[PDB]
Amino acid sequence: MLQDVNTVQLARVVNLAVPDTWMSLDFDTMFKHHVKLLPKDGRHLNTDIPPRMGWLRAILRFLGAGMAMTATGVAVDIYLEDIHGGGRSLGQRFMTWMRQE
Amino acid sequence: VLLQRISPLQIDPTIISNTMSTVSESTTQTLSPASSILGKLRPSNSDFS
Amino acid sequence: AHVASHGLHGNMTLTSSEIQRHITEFISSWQNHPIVQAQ
RNA sequence: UUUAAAAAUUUUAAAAUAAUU
Numbered sequence: 240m241l242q243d244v245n246t247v248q249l250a251r252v253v254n255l256a257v258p259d260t261w262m263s264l265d266f267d268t269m270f271k272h273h274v275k276l277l278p279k280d281g282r283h284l285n286t287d288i289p290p291r292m293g294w295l296r297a298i299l300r301f302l303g304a305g306m307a308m309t310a311t312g313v314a315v316d317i318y319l320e321d322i323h324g325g326g327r328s329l330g331q332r333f334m335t336w337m338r339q340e
Numbered sequence: 341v342l343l344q345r346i347s348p349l350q351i352d353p354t355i356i357s358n359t360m361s362t363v364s365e366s367t368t369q370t371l372s373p374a375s376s377i378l379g380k381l382r383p384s385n386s387d388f389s
Numbered sequence: 390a391h392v393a394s395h396g397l398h399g400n401m402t403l404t405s406s407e408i409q410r411h412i413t414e415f416i417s418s419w420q421n422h423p424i425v426q427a428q
Numbered sequence: 429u430u431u432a433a434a435a436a437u438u439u440u441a442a443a444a445u446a447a448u449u
């Protein structure tokens with residue numbers, strides 16, 4: 240009854256884990272500090288995320304870290320750029336799936 | 341052209357971005373002056389001739 | 390012309406997707422109406 | 429007068445790959 244169920248539903252709908260090869264590296268601080276969801280030149284009205292959709296930041300940090308680790312060379316600071324549709328639209332897309340369980 | 345060759349000034353339009361990224365404004369709001377001026381201004385060192 | 394088609398009118402940095410889709414549906418509705426055009 | 433913190437739980441039972449005792 241505690242721990243409202245907006246998190247278990249997403250955890251059950253999406254399968255995004257840390258791959259095997261990253262086990263030897265420090266991916267934790269890369270998630271925490273070096274994948275920034277506020278883009279480089281400030282707000283955009285597209286990257287805005289609604290207050291009651293916090294799970295989306297998880298998937299955003301996924302995609303940032305993966306896209307940063309895939310390229311050769313040094314790992315770089317990756318910033319969020321743009322979400323087609325919008326934050327609320329993408330959140331509603333995930334939310335229908337979470338609901339349908 | 342020769343003013344470009346001689347002058348020591350150098351226009352780097354990242355000052356505007358670095359000063360506008362430090363603005364504090366909410367997210368549950370359909371207007372944003374920072375983004376608005378960044379769009380209207382479009383800092384790019386393509387043609388400062 | 391392509392980027393103007395992208396943006397609201399040019400840029401899209403000043404319009405939430407909510408209001409944007411609303412005004413797109415509005416304009417598409419009023420597109421072809423005959424206000425914009427025997428004895 | 430408007431916003432927001434949201435839960436970091438387990439040891440997750442089985443089947444495949446790899447490392448070990």
Ligand SMILES: [Mg+2]
Nearest residue numbers: 446447448449
């Ligand atoms: Mg042994």
